[PDB]
Symmetry: C2
Subunit: 107 residues, 2 copies
Amino acid sequence: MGDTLTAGQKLERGGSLQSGNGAYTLTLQDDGNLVLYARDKAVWSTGTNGQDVVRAEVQTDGNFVLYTAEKPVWHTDTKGKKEVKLVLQDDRNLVLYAKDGPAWSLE
Amino acid sequence: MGDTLTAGQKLERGGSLQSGNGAYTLTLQDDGNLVLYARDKAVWSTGTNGQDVVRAEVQTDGNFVLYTAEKPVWHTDTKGKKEVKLVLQDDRNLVLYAKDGPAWSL
């Protein structure tokens, strides 16, 4: 990406900045950590390693920010079901159907 | 949005599902709550009232999931600076330049 990130531009997993003299590289890593390297030595980081960071973005309100991926606060825990559909029924029950039958409901 | 959500669909915020007879509704609300209405009475909730909940999805894995918006973990704390640019400099400093001059650096 060069040595500059302007308002509304962002770094994503794998991408980076590099100084003109090619000595330093700042890169947002897949372990989620934004790390600056002097050659192959890390000299500074966002300490966000082990987090799921998706982007490091120079925002248009002038703020540079790292965002973690959207996380699940609630689920039906039916992962593994095939051909699911959720149906709000006339009997007032909400039901998650699956190829192999009703997978979930309110009750 | 009909009475059904299949594989890879979801309710956006303010989106919903309604019953055939039309008696019952299920909306994902702006307060981030997924509520089920029977006319004027709320009968069931996801308890996500007060959360940045962006969508409720019927996923390909058969799991029906509510997601909250991407969270901030780190920032330069420079909200308000104008015409910003982050620069990786040859001296190995990293600076955020704003219209007014350097706003932030390592």
